[PDB]
Design an enzyme around this catalytic site. Structure first.
Site: not given
Ligand SMILES: CN(C)C(=O)c1ccc(N2CC[C@H](NS(=O)(=O)/C=C/c3ccc(Cl)s3)C2=O)c(F)c1
Lengths: 52, 230
Positions: B42, B84, B181
């Site tokens: 990603h 991923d 990430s």
């Molecule tokens: C299908 N699926 C799972 C999704 O489409 C999806 C895709 C993205 C997110 N999000 C929502 C916001 C967050 N962004 S972050 O804060 O940069 C990463 C923070 C971290 C916390 C501990 C980790 Cl291990 S990575 C993130 O990855 C989500 F919740 C769901």
């Protein structure tokens, strides 16, 4: 707990069971020691070691 | 990284940082060998052209490597975040030194039986130190307990596939965060650190009743081995 289930078969790294006995092995960049258990680095920056 | 501690000299030598054209970090990676970096698939959408920095613990004080080949898992999709994983081959080899060394790749069965069954792993990166904040100028690390798979699935608003695992805390305010990430999740066994996960996704950072989600490296060891041979 027996063999690999007992303190990792006394292996430094990888433990497998072959014909009911422990066989140890090591990651790339390490050689298995004469005792068949310890893993000795081949160079100054072996994988997985903090540089301290 | 929210909470945790600063990586002290030599403590996190496998950390890599993916930097954009403006030389700003946007994702982490793990050093696997002199030519290879492990990261999240990603992350490859977060910048058109990027380079890899190694050896830096403080982004405000003064090796940068260009990427020769990007190997993205062909099954990755943003719809699920499954698969991923990506491997980067560098144009020039990394020189190992203090703060620059590879993490070990474990054998699959042993990793599942011996590493993933440990109490904790370690996550690291230059990500945000709060959900709302700027990227950390200092490399940080955090001890994260492995989370029971049932507990993990129950707490999640999204499907946790077999290529993923949960780590972190239920309510304690410590977690990976934005910018972390692609970075390393390693597990210590007898003073040797093995790569066990890739920082993948989370529902915010350190939120109550939520955990961090990581790509399960054991599910891709053969894939990684093949990607490191061309
Ligand atoms: C299908 N699926 C799972 C999704 O489409 C999806 C895709 C993205 C997110 N999000 C929502 C916001 C967050 N962004 S972050 O804060 O940069 C990463 C923070 C971290 C916390 C501990 C980790 Cl291990 S990575 C993130 O990855 C989500 F919740 C769901």
């Amino acid at each position: 707990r027996k063999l690999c289930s007992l303190d990792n078969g006394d292996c430094d790294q990888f433990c497998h069971e072959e014909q009911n006995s422990v066989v140890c092995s090591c990651a790339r960049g390490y050689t298995l020691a004469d005792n068949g258990k310890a893993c000795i680095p081949t160079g100054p920056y072996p994988c997985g070691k903090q540089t301290l | 990284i929210v909470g945790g501690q600063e990586c002290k000299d030599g403590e996190c030598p496998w950390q890599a940082l993916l930097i954009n054209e403006e030389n700003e970090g946007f994702c982490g990676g793990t050093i696997l060998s002199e030519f290879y970096i492990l990261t999240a698939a990603h992350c490859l959408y977060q910048a058109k052209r990027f380079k890899v920095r190694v050896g830096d613990r403080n982004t405000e004080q003064e090796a940068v490597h260009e990427v020769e080949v990007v190997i993205k898992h062909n099954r990755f999709t943003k719809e699920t975040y499954d698969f991923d994983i990506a491997v980067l081959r560098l144009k020039t080899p990394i020189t190992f030194r203090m703060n620059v060394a590879p993490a070990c790749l474990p054998e699959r069965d042993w990793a599942e039986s011996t590493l993933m069954t440990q109490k904790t792993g370690i996550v690291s990166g230059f990500g945000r130190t709060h959900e709302k904040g700027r990227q950390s100028t200092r490399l940080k690390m955090l001890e994260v307990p492995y989370v029971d798979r049932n507990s993990c699935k129950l707490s999640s608003s999204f499907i946790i596939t077999q290529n993923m695992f949960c780590a972190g805390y239920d309510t304690k305010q410590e977690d990976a965060c934005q910018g972390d990430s692609g970075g390393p999740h390693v597990t210590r066994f007898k003073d040797t650190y093995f790569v066990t996960g890739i920082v993948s996704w989370g529902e915010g950072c350190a939120r109550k009743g939520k955990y961090g989600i990581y790509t399960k490296v054991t599910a891709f060891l053969k894939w990684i081995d093949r990607s490191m041979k061309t």
